[model samples]
Target chain A: SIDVKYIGVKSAYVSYDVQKRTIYLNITNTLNITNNNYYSVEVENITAQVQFSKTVIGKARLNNITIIGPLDMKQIDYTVPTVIAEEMSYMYDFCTLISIKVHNIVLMMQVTVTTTYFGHSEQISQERYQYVDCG
Target chain B: SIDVKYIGVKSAYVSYDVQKRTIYLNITNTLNITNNNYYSVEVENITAQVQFSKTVIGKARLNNITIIGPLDMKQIDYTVPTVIAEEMSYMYDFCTLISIKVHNIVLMMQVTVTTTYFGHSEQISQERYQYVDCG
Candidate 1:
């Protein structure tokens, strides 16, 4: 591990809208890289895709390269589409049958970071997922 | 390298008071030993001595062994007396110097640590020092 650093989720919540009987997902996070480096490191082209099993919910993109300053906080705020939430409710959340696997969630992302000193660029395509919990 | 946690100084300053005509020195530090270990490791009976080329200005002691927990910050504060500061003003900090030898530093102490999974005790007595710079 070159000690590249990691992304930490500051907070995440599943919100329900009573007016439309829909669900909204919110995830906010930031990258924490600590150490004194002579060169500047800049991150850009962040893409996060949400998928239900194999179906695509939607995608969020910040179309510009984000430069992290000496002392700064980068905030990513995403609001999921309500239509995807409604589609998920009828089938995924309700399953009277047991012992069968349920709908799975997958979040994939690609982040590019460049180190100005070495002119070395690091690109990361990460994917992670979890099963939708009824409880 | 076994990655023996390290000691760091959070802050230090030299304050001058014209009314009292005294130089006050204060050193504040903390040991940021991070990461999880099977057994707990701690520091105690710590001593920091002030010196001006071989003369011991004064010694500061915690007076008790200190235990470090999962998330803990231990602060060590020390103050040097005016008389010692005055003596340094008269001689040590001037054209006179060290290594003809120098005042050098002498800091030595014993510490104890404990944990549920594993337990061990290590002792470290260390020393070193420097000057009175007038000019």
Candidate 2:
């Protein structure tokens, strides 16, 4: 079993097009994964889903493969870009004001780390909430 | 005419009521107005109007009478609150995002200073643009 730890959220960037009524959001997050097995493990990919409340706003994927030695901890930095449309009008209104005034916007992120060892595939999923400065 | 100097804008605050679809904006600005006369002048009132482009958004007033000696300059600090409604949909959409990402929003201010000396009334009006951080 691999242990995944959410380090912290670094920053968030938000941009929008008024004409199209589309909002673009990007968040950078860091994580630490420790390989507990006796042999090295190959990290296949990292995928993240961003959500505002129960609505899924954005998703990101890192397809690069890396090998972590046994009993070793590896730090992974990833960024997710979430594009939202006008369909979620209620979410959009609140997000715009909350971010503008307080400069603190909270969102939930679910990260999945896929690994392979001795031709055996393992998937580890972790859910975390982060406060990102959208303003 | 009293020489009014626009020193700078200090800060800006924004809040909203999602249910009512109303937005409240506050901006603090500083100014320096010189007497530019031989005798002391009694300042009756200082009023300001805040606008977004050509649309008037908010207004403020300073009603306390102040006396400025001849050739003296006084730094005046005032805050204006601008409440906007749903009628300005275009401006609202643009302002919400521009302030969120750039942390910089621009607005126009028109200030009027009313003074009296020896029963002679003098009214000075100054218009300037300022960049305030709404994010």
Candidate 3:
């Protein structure tokens, strides 16, 4: 079993446009990746998604991202849509005024992490995530 | 002039097990396809999606008519199933289910209603029979 470490979200901002009735969100996260398995591993096709529920609102894709167990950097500018439709209500609860509480924002991902053994490829495991955004 | 009539949702239910969390639906509709004009007709993948709840946990898929032609009317039976996450919501069934809405379906049966009229292909209209069997 290998271990995955989430360093932190460097920064984030979420806002809404009343004229267009659109929601916008910006975020970036850092992680420390290491291979504890006996075989050599490589990570690629890293995708992150934001889902209001099961519907994917936005996504960020990275191709052939190599990680030799840490000390590397990856940044993403997510495709805008996933900012979510809960917008009308969600923005009121968090963004500018009203009560400040931790609401659940579900973000999930898949990585085509591969092993050096005979071009073997496998995906990262079962996942879920949420964090406090002062947006 | 052509028309599509939505019958109604025949049935729907949510199920969960060790392997999968799923929402199943039975829907039906009808359409008459033939050249109301000079264009030949052909229909491709036909799918009807019913979003029974505002949450992603309640969306379902429809059926496709492989092919159709002049004066051929078909009522396709589909075991429409929408796979959802078992770990989807925090509160429970009622909280996750906010409202049910149907989306505009992609094109279905091939109706040469008009070869000259670019929108020659359209989905058959529908009607529904959902017998809520109290369990």
Candidate 4:
């Protein structure tokens, strides 16, 4: 007999609050595993790309961004999308959730969104996440 | 037909200067390759462990040290050797050089040594280096 498994991101999004200047994303798990165990969470290909016409208050400004996978405590780049200023207030609250399962274990994960801005350039960022069995 | 290659550290050591409170080491190349290129330099498994009786002036003291191969800009530990107090000055000046050759390329390298001291424990340290063609 043979068994198959499905693993990857189940859902992702962003939430923006102009008053607080913060964005967030919520992730969920779709598949079911016989065991209810949590795995180690890791991020890869993390990118934060943004552009600004005026200076913004932040630690670092976003520029051309791209994110690869399998990451640790390091920084990378990202690509910004074209959106109206008014829309940014809403778009800023973006988040991504990654899902993974191994040997009858499954988990749902979420990540907060953070970005920086340059001027009139599409900032790009990418990233991947891995979950290792912990319990 | 196929091609195979062998690469590793040629030689390394430490030189101590009690007057200047400095340590140094010299590295050499043992293989030959056609290319004359300079690759990025990095340090890894870098450890500095030392012991001291009287409070000496300078930087941190060594405790226990160990070094591993295939290193970059990071640090590790090593098992400190037991030598007489008078020998510490000579042993302080220690350094190691790593060599690599690809496609008929050869190069020589060197690194300066520095360390700190604690009280009684045998300090340990370790590190590795890699060389690339720079032409």
Give the least accurate 10-residue stretch of model 2 chain A, judged by summed lDDT. Answer: A110-119
> Residues B1-135, candidate 3, lDDT per residue (tens digit)?
111112221211111122233232332322232322232223222322322112322233322211122232222222323333332223222112122223222222232232112212222222221211111
Report the CAPRI category for model 4.
Answer: incorrect
On residues A1-135, what C-alpha lDDT tens digit does candidate 1 reach at each position?
Answer: 123323342111222112323332343323232323232223222323221122212342222123233332232223322222122112222312222222222221221121111112122322322122222
Tens-place lDDT per residue, model 2, A10-125, is: 21122111232333234232323232323333323333322112221234222212222233222222333334333222233322433432222222112212111111212222
Ten-residue stretch with the least lDDT total in model 1 chain A: A110-119
Q: Given the true complex, what DockQ would model 2 score? A: 0.01
Please give the range of 10 consecutive residues that has the lowest summed lDDT in model 2 chain B.
B9-18
Give the winner by lDDT: 2 or 3. 2
Model 4 spans > 4 angstroms off: A1-122, B1-30, B34-135
DockQ per model, Cα: 0.01, 0.01, 0.01, 0.01
Indicate the TM-score of model 3: 0.14
TM-score of each: 0.14, 0.14, 0.14, 0.10
Question: With candidate 4 superimposed using the best TM-score fit, by how many Å does residue B16's alpha carbon deviate from the native?
Answer: 33
Question: Worst ten-residue run, lDDT, model 4 chain B?
Answer: B103-112
lDDT of 3 by residue, A1-135 (tens): 233433342211222112323332342323233323233333223223322224422343222233233222232222212223232222212222122222212222211121211212122222222122231
lDDT (0-100) at residue A65 of candidate 1?
Answer: 24
